[PDB]
């Protein structure tokens, strides 16, 4: 009664947006290491049970349409939904290959009223991108969980040969405890593992979940 009901045919859809190469008119550089991240993320989430698909170098129109179409699909037999963003980022926005687009516009499509088949089900968003200085009734905003690579305003570090710190940590924890720990315990251990690397960066978790989340039983 205190856990989300996972007794469903599918665990859910998991979209992974992998933006590595950006157009020159944006001014952003190549993201070496993100390929190693996405692959690591693909294996982990597939092990959990997600039906995962990976889209490379997406534009702002693509990302928006990609998640709009996803909120229009039938999730009646799905236990939940998950999206992972791996791109460049500024104050409250995410980058495409042709510019910027708001994160809150990508998630809005999954609001309780905008996506009925996902009501009372968890919508997870994991974002790996930067942020800084730019030059019988139920709520519609409930059951969302965001896991940012960094707090609002600071940088997120990435290694060309090893990949990003947040992703490396996230996959390590999921590989071993993905089936026996609650979602907040996993993300809390990620916070710690990322913190213990410079001794700066520290992930942020925003939870509007109403029950505990486990990926099994």
């Amino acid at each position: 009664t205190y856990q989300y009901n996972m007794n469903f045919e599918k665990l859910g859809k998991c979209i992974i947006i992998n933006n590595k190469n950006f157009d020159k008119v944006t001014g952003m550089g190549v993201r070496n290491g993100t390929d190693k991240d996405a692959e690591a993320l693909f294996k982990c989430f597939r092990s959990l049970g997600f039906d995962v698909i990976v889209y490379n170098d997406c534009s702002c129109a693509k990302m928006q349409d990609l998640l709009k179409k996803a909120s229009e699909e039938d999730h009646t037999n799905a236990a939940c939904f998950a999206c992972i963003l791996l791109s460049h980022g500024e104050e409250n926005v995410i980058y495409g290959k042709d510019g910027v687009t708001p994160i809150k516009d990508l998630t809005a499509h999954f609001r309780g009223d905008r996506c009925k088949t996902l009501l009372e089900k968890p919508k997870l968003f994991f974002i790996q991108a930067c942020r800084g200085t730019e030059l019988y009734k139920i709520p519609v905003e409930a059951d969302f969980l965001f896991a940012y690579s960094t707090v609002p305003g600071y940088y997120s570090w990435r290694s060309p040969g090893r990949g990003s710190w947040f992703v490396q940590a996230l996959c390590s924890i999921l590989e071993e405890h993905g089936k026996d720990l609650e979602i907040m315990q996993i993300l809390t251990r990620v916070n710690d593992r990322v913190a213990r690397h410079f001794e700066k960066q520290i992930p942020c978790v925003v939870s509007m979940l109403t029950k505990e989340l486990y990926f099994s039983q």
Partner: peptide, 4 residues
């Protein structure tokens, strides 16, 4: 290490 590089920045995002």
């Amino acid at each position: 290490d590089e920045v995002x």
